[PDB]
Structures are given as structure tokens and as C-alpha cells.
Design a protein around this ligand. Sequence first.
Ligand SMILES: *Cc1cc2c(nc3c(=O)[nH]c(=O)nc-3n2C[C@H](O)[C@H](O)[C@H](O)COP(=O)(O)OP(=O)(O)OC[C@H]2O[C@@H](n3cnc4c(N)ncnc43)[C@H](O)[C@@H]2O)c(*)c1C
Ligand SMILES: [Cl-]
Ligand code: NA
Ligand code: NA
Length: 490
Amino acid sequence: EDFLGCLVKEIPPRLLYAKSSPAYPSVLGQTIRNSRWSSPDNVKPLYIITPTQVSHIQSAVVCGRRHTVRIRVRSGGHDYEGLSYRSLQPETFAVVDLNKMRAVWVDGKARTAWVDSGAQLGELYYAIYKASPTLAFPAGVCPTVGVGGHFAGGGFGMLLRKYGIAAENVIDVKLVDANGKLHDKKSMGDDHFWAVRGGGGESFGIVVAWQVKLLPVPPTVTIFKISKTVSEGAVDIINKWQVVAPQLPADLMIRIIAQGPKATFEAMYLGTCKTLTPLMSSKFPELGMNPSHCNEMSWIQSIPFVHLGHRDALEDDLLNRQNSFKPFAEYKSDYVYQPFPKTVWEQILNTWLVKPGAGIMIFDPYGATISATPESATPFPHRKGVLFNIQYVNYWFAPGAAAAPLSWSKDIYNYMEPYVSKNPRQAYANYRDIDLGRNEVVNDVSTYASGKVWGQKYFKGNFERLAITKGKVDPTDYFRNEQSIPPLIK
Ligand SMILES: *Cc1cc2c(nc3c(=O)[nH]c(=O)nc-3n2C[C@H](O)[C@H](O)[C@H](O)COP(=O)(O)OP(=O)(O)OC[C@H]2O[C@@H](n3cnc4c(N)ncnc43)[C@H](O)[C@@H]2O)c(*)c1C
Ligand SMILES: [Cl-]
Ligand code: NA
Ligand code: NA
């Protein structure tokens, strides 16, 4: 009652939603991306606040502290476990939903931009394009992902070999801390500014906006998508890829998608077909690339082309808030440091990807710029020595059909254990997976020991620094979820 009373005192009431508000179901659902988490059995927020100004965010946080109601912040809603808008067990929380805070102000000459956290990646990319056809920003492949959660968790895409992760191309932030105080890099200090850029969402406060550096790209880039079935030699070709791809020049990234006994090699090359063709013949002739495979286009056009295979619908693909795609979805991830034996590739392609409920596997090669950053330089630790990341993606489209895909996801993770990183088994924070472990709360504070179990998987040797920083900026564990950094205090 009095939390709401506090809010109503400080924030326009049209931006406040209670469970009985006519628009509450629509507002809650607008950026839910996973049909597992939209159904009525999920724990729902007591209130939703949709700020349009930073002062609204500050007021909400102050009210939450005064009245001990915790807040889960949502930007784009893509959290794989829905932790921006649901809790796992019954509890009281509000959602602060930033979708109305979505401005992207580009300074083309300075090669910087201020990007509100509620902007989607496609809007960031498009605004850069409206300023220049030869500037880019290295973030993810999915246009509807929110800036806020993506940057907080690191963020990587088809420019990761050239420029690293999104969070390491952030030069300032505007942030509201657990006390409602507005911060930037200077006021935050080294530890807090280190942590917020890749240490995971929620834990380190609400980032309102991010200042980014913009990076040059050639006026023409080249994409190819070359598939090989097992009959066409996929096993031998992927067995070569895993050694070659992380060693290729920074201008060339060749990822793989597999969803049966066939691998699709998807490349983005910062250059022309004319130079790509001989590069491929020299470094990876086994793929059989020739100029007919080239698709030359602008960098901005590569975003819909890579993700959707579209060539012709730039605005529709990048400026999309309809939320039409809502699979039931499960996700896992791994990091690989040692090449798989050929027999493991055989099993993956011929056996694991031909099972009931089998998902898709996406393999992103590292090396080059992402791997040149030291493991501790940012919270994202998956750097030197990484050959590739694996994402295991399971989509399905019927309620009551979760058993088979969920079992497959668990079973393949067990199969892969001997071949991927260990001690700890590394995972990417933005590919959130609650089965890696969850927090225990004691005396209303997430415990350090429970956080460490999953935290070392996402953050390796950076976990303790994250937790000490958490203890300094939020000792009472105000901004938390089931898998957020616990405070480590004296
Ligand atoms: C759905 C989806 C996700 C993808 C896709 N492709 C990706 C890619 O090419 N590269 C990647 O690096 N990641 C990809 N992912 C995963 C996303 O990066 C993650 O799912 C992001 O965490 C999503 O961010 P967002 O859409 O903003 O999701 P939310 O659910 O709102 O938040 C996630 C997490 O972060 C906290 N949080 C949100 N907003 C803030 C702010 N402003 N400040 C701090 N913390 C914030 C939330 O509370 C939550 O814990 C492709 C597709 C299709
Ligand atoms: Cl996620
Ligand atoms: Na290890
Ligand atoms: Na999951």
C-alpha cells in the first residue's frame, strides 16, 4: 500500500501499473520473449513502473528502499530465465521497465553515442547508420535485445573478433545505485565501473544510459553462408575449422550453426569478395568457398542478413517492437579450449542433433581481439585460449511439450562435459542458465557461498572482485535476483 503511495507521490500515475490495472497484462507481456515465462503460473510483479525520465527511476528506487520492496529492472526482456520480470518462487517485487527510455544520440564526428538502456540493439545500430554508413558498434546479432541487459552481461556478436565485447567499448555510463544516487564513471570509481561493464545485469544498479565508442567498418562487408552435410565432409571440415577459425585474421569471423547432420558456416568479413576469396583459399580451402558464395552489403545490412537471411527490409527488421516471436525456450552454453576429437564431432552431428527434442548448436570462434584482453581486465573472463563458445538453443511452440527438449538440453550437457572447460565449467552470463546454480538468501542477503557456485562459471577468477564491489555499492543486497552477485562485506 505505502510503496505504491510513495510512487504515486513522485511519478506520473500513468506510468504505474498494479495487477488490477487494465493495461498491466499487456505491459508485463510486451517484452517477454519466452513462452515458458509468460503463463499464469509464473510469479508476477506487484507493480510495474515504466519511467520516461531518470528522475522517475531515482524516485522508484528511493521508494523501494524506504518501503523495502525490491525491484527487478527490465530493458529488452530477453533474459533467458525471465529474471527481469519474474521470480522463481513467490515473493514481492516491482518491475522497473525501461522500454520508454530508448533514445540513441550519435555524435558521428566524435565517434561516440549515448544509448538509453531501453533501446533495442536494432535501434542502436540503425541510429548509427543514420549518422554514418561506415561506423559500427560490436554487439549482438538479435535486433530486439535490450541494450541494458546485453551490455551489463558483456554482449558479443559478429564483430567480436575485431573489437571484443560490447561492454569493453563502453566509455561512460549514467547509473542509479541502490540508494537512488545518480552516478557516472567518475563518481563510481574503478571497481564499480569495472563491474557494471560485464558483471551481469541487476547486481550493480540500474544503468540508465551507456556512452559508447563507435568503430570504423568498411563501406562494403561480405557475408557467406556455406552448408556442408556429413556426406559433404562436415566432420572433417568442422574438425579443421576449430583450429583455423580462432587463428584467422581479425577481419574474418566464421561462426557455425548446426541442427542435424549438417553444419552451416556463416562468415562476416570486413572487406570485399575480391580479397576474401584468396584469403579463404589460403587459410581454409577445405570449406570450398568461391566468389558465388559472397554477399556484399553495408555493415547495417549485415545485421538483418546474418540473423534473418533478409536482404531487403532494413527498417522493418531493425525497428521492431511487435514482439511476434515467443518460443518456449531453453538455453545452455560452454567454452572450449582444446580441440574436440573427430569422434566427438561425429557424435554431435550424427547422433546428438538427431534426437527427440534436439536443439540447435551455435559455435562462435574467439581468438584475435576478444582473446587479447586479459581475463581480469573486465568481468568477462572467457578470453585467451578460447577456441570457441557453444550455445545450445532449444525452441518449441506448444505448451506441455517441454519434457523432451529439457531432457535433451541436460543430456547433451552431460555428454559434452569431458570436452569443454572445467574447474570451473565456464558459461556466458548473458546465456543465463539457472541450472548452473542459484543463490540462497539468509537474513535477507544472498550468500557468498551460494553465489560462488554459478558465479565462478560466468566470471571465473573475477567473481570475488565482483562480490567485494557488490558489498561496497549494495551491502544490503537490494538489487538482486536468484543469480545475482552476492555482497562480500567485512
Ligand atoms: C532473446 C535473445 C537474446 C540474445 C540474442 N543474441 C545474443 C547475441 O548475439 N549476443 C549476446 O551476447 N547475447 C545474445 N542474447 C542474450 C542477451 O544478451 C541477454 O538475454 C541479455 O541479458 C538481454 O538483455 P535485455 O534484452 O535488456 O534483457 P532483460 O531481461 O531486460 O535484462 C537481462 C538482465 O539484466 C538486467 N538488466 C536489464 N536492464 C538493466 C539495466 N538498465 N541496468 C542493469 N541491469 C539491467 C535484468 O534485471 C536481467 O537480470 C538473441 C535473442 C533473440
Ligand atoms: Cl539471458
Ligand atoms: Na579450467
Ligand atoms: Na534455463
